[PDB]
Amino acid sequence: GSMSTSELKKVVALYDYMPMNANDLQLRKGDEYFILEESNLPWWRARDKNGQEGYIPSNYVTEAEDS
Numbered sequence: 001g002s003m004s005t006s007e008l009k010k011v012v013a014l015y016d017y018m019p020m021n022a023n024d025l026q027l028r029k030g031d032e033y034f035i036l037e038e039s040n041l042p043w044w045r046a047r048d049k050n051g052q053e054g055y056i057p058s059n060y061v062t063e064a065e066d067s
Contacts, residue, residue, distance in 0.1 A: 001036070010034050010064030011046065017060055025054025032064040 001008075010032050017027040025048055027033065033056055037045035042058035 007038075008035065011056065011061035012064055013061050015060055017057065019054060023055050025052065025056055026050065027056060027060060033061060034064075 012032040013027045013029055015027075015029050017024065019026055025033065025046065027048065031048070033046045033048045035044060035046040035056070036053060039045075044056045044058065045053055046056040046061075047053040
């Protein structure tokens with residue numbers, strides 16, 4: 001985001017998706033990440049537990065937690 005932050009939420013993971021070149025993020029199954037983007041496409045720019053940002057397909061992930 002450019003203005004400090006705009007609704008920063010997280011998401012869970014449904015399947016694995018290791019990086020291929022560098023953009024892709026090291027996702028997995030059952031793990032959850034942190035969402036930093038929200039463009040108009042399924043692919044986002046969220047980070048995982050390693051504080052590293054990459055790409056998170058919307059279908060691949062869902063909501064971080066529910067409480």
